[PDB]
């Protein structure tokens, strides 16, 4: 992981989530459950669908073409054909082989990026109202039910509503 | 109470090489390489290719008796000989600029 | 088909093939390799 998401601080991925690529695991008083963030997942797929499209669609420049047509009293020119034909085969193989290897590293890192940005989007909404565990989780200082947590996903979470509940829970432990 | 973030993973086996790592097991994938063929030679944009089975081009232009010149196809895209066609010239000889005439006749409209 | 080869005939949607070097028509690019697979998802962890 370049962004330190996937190999890094989130060791392993939720197998029970099968809605999207990226998402959340709530475990509050009402129950537990996975819930995938479809909006960020959609942008990723829109992106990847467009990479793969672009790698094929840009090579549309191809025309007519042929095979071999010289007699054994013109072997010099037949060798010039071979040089050219083998030459292109070398270039295209190399360029293709590497292009895959290069765009595959960045494709994997684009996912790391999306996950670290999602974790950061949650982190910035709830500054001192929760505790950064380091397994990429968030322990709440206050009680947040199923109707409260949609606000975190939606991104409409009120800091001032639950500010005093957490702040004055903090000094109780700090003895 | 908790909210913890993560990323999908399923039961896929499809390995993909990358520049810094090799044989990396990845969730989904796309093939870019065409590996398959129908194994039977076909038209090029509606145009019947000229297939010469036991006959070469030389023997087809001239009236070689052993193969047949019943091919009244008036249009083609490419010619198809075999490796060593069995009937080049019944009466032995030579054809002048044969290869160039071959190229000329390779694709005819009428 | 849109292009031909001594072995067979090719579809030619994707941009590389590995069938036969000497082709007739609008073929993709002949490449000497068995695998060109592109990543779309992310690292699968067991």
């Amino acid at each position, epitope marked *: 992981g370049l962004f330190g998401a996937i190999a890094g601080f989130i060791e392993g991925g939720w197998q029970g989530m099968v*809605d999207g690529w990226y998402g959340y695991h709530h475990s509050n008083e009402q129950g537990s459950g996975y819930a995938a963030d479809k909006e960020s997942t959609q942008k990723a797929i829109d992106g990847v669908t467009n990479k793969v499209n672009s790698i094929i669609d840009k090579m549309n420049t191809q025309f007519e073409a042929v095979g071999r047509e010289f007699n054994n009293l013109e072997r010099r020119i037949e060798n010039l054909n071979k040089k050219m034909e083998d030459g292109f085969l070398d270039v295209w193989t190399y360029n293709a082989e590497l292009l895959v290897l290069m765009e595959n590293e960045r494709t994997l890192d684009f996912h790391d990026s999306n996950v670290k940005n999602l974790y950061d989007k949650v982190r910035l909404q709830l500054r001192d109202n929760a505790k950064e565990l380091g397994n990429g989780c968030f322990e709440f200082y206050h009680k947040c039910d199923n109707e409260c947590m949609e606000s975190v996903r939606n991104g409409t979470y009120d800091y001032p509503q639950y500010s005093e509940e957490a702040r004055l829970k903090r000094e109780e432990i700090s003895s | 109470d908790q909210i913890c973030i993560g990323y999908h993973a399923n039961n896929s086996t499809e390995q993909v090489d990358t520049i810094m790592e090799k044989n990396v097991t990845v969730t989904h994938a796309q093939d870019i390489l065409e590996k398959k063929h129908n194994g039977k030679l076909c038209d090029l944009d509606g145009v019947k290719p000229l297939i010469l089975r036991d006959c070469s081009v030389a023997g087809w232009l001239l009236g070689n008796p052993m193969c047949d010149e019943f091919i009244n196809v008036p249009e083609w895209s490419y010619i198809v000989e075999k490796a060593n066609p069995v009937n080049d010239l019944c009466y032995p000889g030579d054809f002048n600029d044969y290869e160039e005439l071959k190229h000329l006749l390779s694709r005819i409209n009428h | 088909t849109k292009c031909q080869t001594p072995m067979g005939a090719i579809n030619s949607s994707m941009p590389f093939h590995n069938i036969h070097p000497l082709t007739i028509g609008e073929c993709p690019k002949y490449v000497k390799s068995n695998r060109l697979v592109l990543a779309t998802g992310l690292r699968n962890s067991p």
Partner: antibody
Amino acid sequence: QLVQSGAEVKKPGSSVKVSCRASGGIFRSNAISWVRQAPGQGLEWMGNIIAVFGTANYAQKFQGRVTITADESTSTAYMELSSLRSEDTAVYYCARGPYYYGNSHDFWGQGTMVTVSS
Amino acid sequence: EIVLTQSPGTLSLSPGERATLSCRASQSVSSNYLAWFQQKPGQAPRLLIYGASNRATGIPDRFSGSGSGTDFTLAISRLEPEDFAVYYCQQYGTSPRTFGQGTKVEIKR
């Protein structure tokens, strides 16, 4: 841009599989849904199948007797229907929608006549 | 399920006038995710409008949508020969996603 299979005529009880090949050069990016229409009367939505993961959602009306699969390489969706009645006789449409979700629609298929009278 | 009812089931209007199709929902419709579609005889459906009021691409300005919550309305300003057909509303806010039962528009004579 969307293509469906040909007409098929089955006896009641016998099952029917219908294929909607989207296109799409590549792996599909769009959630195929399915909407039937018994001649004369209007449209009845059946089920949708999201793009990348293969997870389907059906209507509570059918649930136990309909299944829709997804073949990722060729970007084709399928629709299997079990224990067919006389009233299942209809025209079945697949519809792709603008992204994997599935939510609004946009591009509709052609359709497939399926007669169930024996 | 959320059952949608359309009205009126048949409009009899002349070429030029305004048509006003209704779509009432048994319950509120989650976040204005309702759509209208047009079907002519023999053909497959067209998309007209999604998200209550947003036009789809390749559609005249005379088709326009409105409403929210439980009541929704599709209006056509200047009817023309091509518009006489069946019109279906659907909600897609939650599974199962249901359709209205056909509000047809025919020529007056």
